[PDB]
Chains A and B, each alone.
Chain A
Amino acid sequence: PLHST
């Protein structure tokens, strides 16, 4: 993933 949740 390229960002957090």
Chain B
Amino acid sequence: HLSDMLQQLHSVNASKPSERGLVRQEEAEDPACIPIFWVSKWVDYSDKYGLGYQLCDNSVGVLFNDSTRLILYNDGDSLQYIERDGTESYLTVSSHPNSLMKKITLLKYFRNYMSEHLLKAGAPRLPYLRTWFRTRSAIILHLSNGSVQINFFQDHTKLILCPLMAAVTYIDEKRDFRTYRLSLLEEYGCCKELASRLRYARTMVDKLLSSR
């Protein structure tokens, strides 16, 4: 769905939403498009192990440096493991193959760090982390459901983009969480802050597509 997201962003950005007449941004809000999932917390320990994250439903996941993935459901015991070849298996923290001991231990550490520390973003209407990268200004998180989340480090603003809803959720500096239909942003416009971040988003989606 990355190509679909790129086309949706091309379209909003070509409409010059902050550059025409009266902006009626509120008329572009669509609460029926609120995301089901987003990333509420993350820990980059990629110099050694990988990227650990919490989703807004309190489930956790890790994308390990070897491109395997472990996902802990919010029941606190049920696990999904995804091997390098895509094979998915189900198990629990209590009942697992000995070969997963190290990875399960690592997940417990990430999980405990994100339970004890850090603020839950978006404090909804499982996807796993397909890929991520960081720039100087942001971290870019691409979920397997097609959603792309962009967290800006300096000002703590965030975008959650969903190509299925063709929607963007913008979390501003005050932590106000508004969800917009992209095509309604074309129709009604938006502020220059949101417009700039959507221009950036397009560049990030191009980076995802060109590196997938």
> Could you list which residues of chain A lie within 8 angstroms of chain B, going by C-beta atoms?
1-5
Distance in angstroms between the alpha carbons of A5 and B54 in the assembled complex? 13
CB-CB < 8 A to A1: which residues of B? 44, 153
Name B residues whose Cβ lies closer than 8 Å to a Cβ of A.
Answer: 39, 41-45, 113, 117-119, 121, 151, 153, 156
Extra contacts, 9 of them, besides A2-B44, A3-B43, A4-B42 (Cβ < 8 A), are A1-B44, A1-B153, A2-B45, A3-B41, A3-B42, A3-B44, A3-B117, A4-B119, A5-B119
Chain A residue at minimal CB-CB distance from B47: A2
Question: Separation in Å of the B97 CB from the closest CB of chain A?
Answer: 30
Which residues from A are CB-within-8-Å of B153? 1
Q: In the bound complex, how far is the Cα of B113 from the Cα of A4, in angstroms?
A: 11
* 5 A-B pairs with least C-beta separation: A3-B43, A4-B42, A2-B44, A4-B41, A5-B119
A3's nearest neighbour on chain B, judged by CB, is B43
**B residues in contact with A3, CB < 8 Å:** 41-44, 113, 117-118
